[PDB]
């Protein structure tokens, strides 16, 4: 035994063979209880799955052989031995994840498997409580994964009862200093969705509006966090989440009645939500059109064009093509547009000058310009000259289509 | 009647060992970028020569 401890000091690299040999000695000496607790300690201490498999298998077969030998005959020992045998058979999944809880303790995916293996939700709460303390936010690898743990933990209460408990838990969640911001969206979007089904969307706005308290000097805070290298929490640039702005806007836009008007409170609030997104430069081309279509559906068409003009310069010319198409298609054909013909021509000439200055295929704008010029004044000669400008200015198939239309019209 | 329980336990344990050993042997997309992302992407991925121009270019290469 003393020599055993000496090699435990001297050779730590082959611990598996050491523990197996000492276990064999314990079995040979009749120290079955010693074998039991020694194997338990070693099994808890394993770290690599190949090592775990050998010790777990040896423990399982030792229990099997000892129980069968005692059965060959004592009652209490046999009862305890087959009880441990059945326990080790069943607890394989628990030991399986016990290995992964030591390979990387803060990898939250394993905690989301350990919860799944628990028998009852009364235990799922306990495992979530352990997981929250064991996990440290600074080392969570995959972004947006710890937030899923708080989201699931709150949902666990929310499914049964005690909505107050879920809310008070979640208020603790947002206080955790997360390194990444996907973890924060996963909590706010879930909390707002769960409140929407219960307390109405009036409350559901408040949950997201607390997250989007825009601070002064956004550039300074975004610089501090971006250049902080995980040192600064994502709590301070929460305003810079596109997914929270998108869901907040979805809730506002779905809450606006289809017959809303400028004096309605929700319609004004949606305007401020969109204008603040544009000011923050979080507007995406699909959202810049979503805003313009919201305004057009509410008969505020003349202010729809201000959206297009506020947003077109920000994007690269390749995307300016799509927004220019939308802008001109709405301007030329819509009963509420008050643009004079010289204004619509000014828009068209601006679009063609800017886009053709960057080589973007402008066939559709040229065709729309020719059609508009035929519509508004009836000057066919000017319409043809516009098409010829398109064909004469590398997109060879488009220039062949403009040559066929220009010539056929002439 | 512990014999039947032992038999069932051994049957389950064989499968547990087999599974453990098997685990042991392993030993339109562009319309959604924000303006900020466009600024980042657009900054990360944006005959004859006079002797004075060639000189400056050679200096820069050096």
């Amino acid at each position: 035994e003393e020599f055993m401890r000496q090699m435990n000091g001297i050779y730590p690299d082959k611990w598996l063979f050491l523990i197996l040999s000492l276990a064999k000695y314990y079995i040979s000496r009749g120290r079955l209880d010693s074998c039991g607790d020694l194997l338990k300690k070693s099994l808890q201490q394993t770290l690599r799955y190949s090592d775990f498999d050998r010790i777990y298998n040896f423990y399982l077969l030792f229990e099997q052989e000892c129980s069968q030998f005692i059965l060959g005959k004592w009652t209490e020992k046999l009862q305890a031995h087959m009880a441990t045998f059945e326990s080790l058979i069943n607890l394989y999944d628990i030991y399986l994840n016990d290995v992964a809880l030591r390979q990387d303790s803060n990898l939250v995916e394993t905690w989301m498997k350990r919860v799944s293996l628990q028998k009852s939700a009364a235990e799922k709460c306990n495992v979530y409580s352990e997981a929250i303390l064991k996990i440290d936010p600074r080392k969570v690898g995959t972004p947006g994964s710890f937030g899923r743990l708080w989201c699931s933990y709150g949902d666990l209460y929310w499914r049964s009862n005690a909505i107050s408990t879920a809310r008070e838990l979640w208020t603790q969640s947002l206080k955790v200093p997360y390194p990444y911001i996907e973890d924060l969206e996963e909590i706010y979007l879930n909390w707002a969705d769960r409140e929407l089904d219960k307390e109405g969307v009036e409350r559901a706005f408040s949950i997201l509006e607390d997250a989007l308290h825009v601070p002064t000097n956004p550039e300074i805070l975004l610089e501090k966090y971006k250049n902080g290298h995980r040192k600064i929490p994502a709590q301070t640039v929460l305003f810079n989440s596109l997914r929270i702005w998108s869901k907040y806007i979805d809730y506002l836009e779905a809450y606006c009645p289809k017959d809303a008007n400028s004096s309605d409170k929700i319609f004004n609030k949606t305007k401020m939500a969109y204008n603040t997104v544009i000011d923050l430069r979080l507007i995406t081309p699909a959202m810049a059109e979503n805003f313009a279509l919201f305004l057009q559906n509410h008969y505020e068409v003349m202010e729809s064009f201000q959206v297009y003009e506020k947003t077109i310069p920000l994007f690269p010319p390749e995307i300016q093509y799509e927004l220019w198409i939308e802008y001109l298609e709405v301007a030329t054909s819509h009963q509420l547009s008050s643009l004079s013909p010289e204004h619509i021509r000014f828009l068209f000439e601006k679009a063609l000058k800017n886009l053709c200055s960057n080589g973007i295929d402008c066939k559709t704008i040229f065709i729309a310009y020719s059609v508009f010029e035929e519509r508004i004044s009836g000057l066919i000669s000017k319409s043809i000259e516009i098409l010829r400008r398109g064909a004469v200015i590398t997109h060879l198939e488009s220039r062949l289509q403009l040559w066929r239309m220009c010539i056929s019209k002439a | 009647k512990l014999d039947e329980k032992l038999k069932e336990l051994k049957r389950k344990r064989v499968d547990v060992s087999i599974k453990s050993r098997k685990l042991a042997d392993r030993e339109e997309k562009a319309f959604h970028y924000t303006v900020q992302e466009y600024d980042a992407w657009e900054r990360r991925h944006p005959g004859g020569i006079s002797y004075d121009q060639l000189a400056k270019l050679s200096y820069e290469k050096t």
Partner: peptide, 24 residues
């Protein structure tokens, strides 16, 4: 139309699913 208005019309149609939960 085909590029962005086509997507946005789908967005205004998906919001009917949110409107169901809005009223209920």
């Amino acid at each position: 139309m085909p590029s962005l208005r086509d997507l946005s019309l789908e967005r205004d149609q998906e919001l009917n699913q949110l409107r169901a939960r809005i009223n209920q």
